[PDB]
Structure formats: C-alpha cells, structure tokens
C-alpha cells in the first residue's frame, strides 16, 4: 500500500444521444462506468489520508478545465497579452457524475469512517476501482449538488489555527436553493433571485455554529458577508443552464451564534431568504487569470433548483470569531467530494 501518483482516468454514464455538453465531453473523454463495481472492505488495515495534498484533486481540476474549454466557449477570451475569438452559441448545460478510476497496478482506497475529517488515520478502509459519481459543479461560497455527511456536520480544514486555510463545512442535511431568472411588467433579462427556506437555514447555521464552537470554544461565533474583491468570490456564483449567475449573499451569511443559540440577522420575508442575482456576460475566469465574454442570456425562464450540501468559510484574523463565505479555488470543490479517496500502488 505505497502511496503514489499516476494518471487516473474518468468514467461516466454519459449517454450517446445527449446533446448536453457534459455528456458530449464525457463520451469522448471518459469510458463507460460499471453497473456493479466491486468494493472490498478491509476492517483490519488503517491508512492515513490527506484531502489537502491529494493528487486526485489536481487531475480532476485539469479534466474540468478541459471540459469547460470544449463546452462553454466564450465569444472572446482576454488573457493579458492575447484575445481569442470563437463562435459562442448557446448550449445545453447540466453537470453529470464523473467517476475517477485507478489504472491497473494501482487501487483507490476509500475511507469508510463516516465522521472522517479528511486528515490522519482512518480505521475502516475499503478498496474500489472507481470513486463514486461526482458532479463537477463550479461555484463559490455554497457547495451545490454534492453528497451529504452521513452522521453529524463535519468541519474540514488543513489547519483550523491558520485562518488563511479554507474551511469546508460538510452538511448532513441538504438545504434547498431555487434560483430563477423569470420569463413594463418585465424590465431586465439579467435579474434573477434565489429563495432559501429561512427556518431550514436558521437550523443549519445553528448546527454549523455548534460544530464551529467545539473548535473555537468560549467565543461568540459570527457569520458575516464576504470581504470585498472579485465579484465571483464576493457573491455566490455558479453556472445555471449555461448562464453565469452572481447571487448576493449578504442576507444569508449574517447571524450570530451566542450561548448555544443561533440568531439570524439577515433580512427575510415570508419565512424566506431572498438573494438578488445578476446574470453577467464579462466573467473573471477560474481556469486561469483573465476574462471571458459571453452572449446575453437565453429567452424564457431559467431555473436551477439545487441542494446546498456544503459551505466554504474563512475565519477573520485577529475576543470573538467571525466567519465569511469563501471559495474561488475550485480544487476545494473537488476536495469536498474526493476527501475520502486516495490512490495507492499495489506493488
């Protein structure tokens, strides 16, 4: 069981007849997935994992960059010294699950410890040929459409003492988020909004605040909106149906957790938290430094009904502790699903 790097390959259940661009890309870039993949539990062996130094993440990153290069073609791409022009037709866009697979001579160890924080020893290890299916959802602040924690909320970080290390909050219950650009009674084709059930979110940060306090005891735990910067990271940004949404989260990350109780202080209405969103055409790229420019949005109603399954938090540096939404490095998005896996060489 000697840890090792090697070129993984992706597998998917992509469908030959599907025009959706994830299917199209996986059709030529991945192999079909197995209906019954074998898994061999080993209750005896204990191996150490490290989700923050896992070469599987970097290989996934390169594939997703590569998928976006073939799929979401911008009208023009501006990178410092250059400007590339292409046809930018509108496209059908809906992420599908990708599995990562070890070539022969290597195996994938899977941690079965349902509260494993991503670092150190895992006592219950399995062997699989491929990971489970991971939807490559590119987003900031909120992790969408992932998998849930099995027991309690899990706090992951490379080092909770180092405030510059991103914190990944793995929820154990999804929180529904519905964003829509609706179909003069209309006035702007670039305005959208998201709805989140207030009590569901009140209960979430209550239990997230409980887990955070375990790590930062005797402190008031505050949630505050993003620090300033690029719009991609100061808002909850994500792609919906090919359109780039930027959703303001100031009413979302806005509460205090004192004396074991969470007190939401963001704005709310019919028991619902609303985020105002813009659809933007000029976006700052996450694949590399520069800008990409897209056509105006499609007609009709644009809706993404998603499941928040995790959060990206950052703690302010210095008698209190303040947490803001983070993200930006999509490697953390892949880490949040690949944490339990580790590629190993069967010498």
């Amino acid at each position, epitope marked *: 069981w000697k840890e090792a790097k090697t070129t993984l390959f992706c597998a998917s259940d992509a469908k030959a007849y599907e025009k959706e661009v994830h299917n199209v890309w996986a059709t030529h870039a991945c192999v079909p997935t197995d209906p019954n993949p074998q898994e061999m539990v080993l209750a005896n062996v204990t191996e150490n994992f490290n989700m923050w130094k896992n070469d599987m993440v970097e290989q996934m990153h390169e594939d997703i960059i590569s998928l976006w290069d073939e799929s979401l073609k911008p009208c023009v791409k501006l990178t410092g*010294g250059s400007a590339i022009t292409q046809a930018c037709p509108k496209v059908s866009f809906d992420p599908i699950p990708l599995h990562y697979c070890a070539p022969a001579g290597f195996a994938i160890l899977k941690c079965n410890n349902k509260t494993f924080n991503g670092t150190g020893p895992c006592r219950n290890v399995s062997t699989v040929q491929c990971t489970h299916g991971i939807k490559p959802v590119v987003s900031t602040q909120l992790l969408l459409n992932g998998s849930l924690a099995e027991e309690e909320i899990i706090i992951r970080s490379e080092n909770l003492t180092n405030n*510059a290390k991103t914190i990944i909050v793995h929820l154990n219950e999804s929180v529904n988020i519905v964003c829509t650009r609706p179909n003069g009674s209309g006035g702007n084709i670039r305005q959208a909004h998201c709805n989140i059930n207030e009590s569901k979110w009140n209960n979430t940060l209550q239990k997230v605040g409980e887990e955070l306090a375990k790590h930062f005891p005797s402190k008031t735990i505050k949630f505050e909106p993003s*620090s300033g910067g*690029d719009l991609e990271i100061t808002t909850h940004s994500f792609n919906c149906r090919g359109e780039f949404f930027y959703c303001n989260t100031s009413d979302l990350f806005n509460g205090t957790y004192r004396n074991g109780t969470y007190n939401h202080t963001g704005r709310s209405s019919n028991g619902t938290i609303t985020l105002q969103c813009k659809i933007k055409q000029i976006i700052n790229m996450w694949q590399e*430094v520069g800008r990409a420019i897209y056509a105006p949005p499609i007609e009709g109603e644009i809706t993404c009904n998603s499941n928040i399954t995790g959060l990206l938090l*950052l*703690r*302010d540096g210095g008698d209190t502790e303040t947490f803001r939404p983070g993200g*930006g490095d999509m490697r953390d998005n892949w880490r949040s699903e690949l944490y339990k896996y580790k590629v190993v060489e069967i010498k």
Partner: nanobody
Amino acid sequence: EVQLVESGGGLVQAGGFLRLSCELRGSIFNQYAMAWFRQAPGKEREFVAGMGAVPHYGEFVKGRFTISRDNAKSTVYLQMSSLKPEDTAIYFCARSKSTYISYNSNGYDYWGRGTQVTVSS
C-alpha cells in the same frame, strides 16, 4: 517551492513617486492573482492594490497607484505617485490562493518579507 522576490520601496519625499515590483517564482503566474497589502505600526494589515483579471484598489488610493501584471516576467508592479506621510508602512507582496482577488488577507497563502516605504516631508 514558492517564493516572492520583492523590489523597490524605501524612502520617498512627500509628493514623490515610487515603484514596487514582485516576482513570483516556483509557481505558475497566470494561475494566481497578486496583491499588495500594507501594515502601518499599530494597525491591521490592509489591502492596497491587487490584480487577477482586473485591478482593485483600496479606498485610500484615489487613483494615485497603478497595478499591472507582466506574464513574461512573472511579475506584478505597483506604481505609486503623490505619496503622503499617511502612506508610510511596510508593504507586503502576496500571492492569492486562486485566480481571484480578496481584500481580506486570508485569501492569500504566500507573502513577501515586506519592504518599508517611508514618506518624508
């Protein structure tokens, strides 16, 4: 292994011009945004100027500073004009964790050693 080579700075007369530069080594430049923070004595490190896809400036800048990127030289530059005693501080180069700029110092995992800028009247 990542290192930031800082250049420029030191003593300026009030109203003068100064240039700061910072070469990123052991990392792919066009993968990371770069920024300058400053720390005056007794104060919190504060964001001055940063650039990934687009430049950002701290509120106290007021169009006096220009930040730019040189991909060929893996270097980012800060041109500071109309400097004032208020601008005296240790200036730190920083490499972002990503392609994006945050104003909060915790969006950065690599820091230069810091160079003193002193504006003398």
